[PDB]
Design a protein around this nucleic acid. Sequence first.
DNA 1: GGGGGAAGGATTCC
DNA 2: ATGGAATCCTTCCCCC
Length: 341
Amino acid sequence: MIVLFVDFDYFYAQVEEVLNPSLKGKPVVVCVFSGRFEDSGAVATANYEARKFGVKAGIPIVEAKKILPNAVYLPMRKEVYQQVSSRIMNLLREYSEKIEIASIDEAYLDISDKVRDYREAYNLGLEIKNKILEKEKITVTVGISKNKVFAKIAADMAKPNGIKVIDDEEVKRLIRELDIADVPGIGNITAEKLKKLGINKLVDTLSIEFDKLKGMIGEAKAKYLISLARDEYNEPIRTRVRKSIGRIVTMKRNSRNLEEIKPYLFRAIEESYYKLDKRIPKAIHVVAVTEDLDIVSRGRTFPHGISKETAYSESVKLLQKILEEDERKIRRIGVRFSKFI
DNA sequence: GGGGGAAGGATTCC
DNA sequence: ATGGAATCCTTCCCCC
Ligand SMILES: [Ca+2]
Ligand SMILES: [Ca+2]
Ligand SMILES: [Ca+2]
Ligand SMILES: [Ca+2]
């Protein structure tokens, strides 16, 4: 088996540049504002110009500005970035029929019955970096190896505009010498847990009793890491299917006033129901971010589908269970439809 | 002893 | 300090 993984370089910022080529060479930060105060909000992504000074995804806009006051701060235009991605995904389906669109800027190609050896692989890699650069004027990074995970690690190593092949013998030196926090699925919480278990490199999972491992990181992560380390991971490329839609908005100010919140809550629903297309969810969740950035949500499943009018009614109820049950002020409120028929 | 769901929270990734 | 979505984990639930 051979996986070719494609990762679109500094994606949103790169789109804003493509759409205004004057931006190239300049620090570019794609911002998501919140309209509480003037520069309230957070950073979505930024180019490598900006990123080289610590301006990354997730920091507040405010921080970013202290660091690079004269950078180009642009507001997020997701609709736009979505149409552009789509076109590249269509283009991608013209190389393998076996394709997993994993995110707005990521995809996996199964190219086993379409190439022999990593030399051919590598070449088809170049054909795609190219075709995209020509068609949609976008740089990407490509990773090639035997499974999705090592395909994706390969890409992570070559970013940006890179390409990298991990062969089977290097996969082995990796398992020995790769930091576990660098494995996909291992956020900061899981990395630290493993540290305490004295698990630093992929190989360390073999030296520990499965039950203790399972006890610390759950059964799924457990078997995931273990199979990865045994050179036995081989999960299949398949058409991902969208299982929930939803909106979340930030309120001008934190509050516990039902009548103050509702106008944000219904706007979330309006946007949500627009985003639904013609899909009918059986389920609805009302999602609150309390003042301390904790998250809490009540939901409900129907035996039928949920009309806009009905969803209004239930969301108001579910909002109340929150305010009743939880005792915090609420900073953000949104909705999420799922269980579509 | 176990299969489903369903709900609430956890964690991750882009 | 945003906003979107997936996955997995525990408990609870009903019932066989
Ligand atoms: Ca990317
Ligand atoms: Ca990581
Ligand atoms: Ca909590
Ligand atoms: Ca990425």
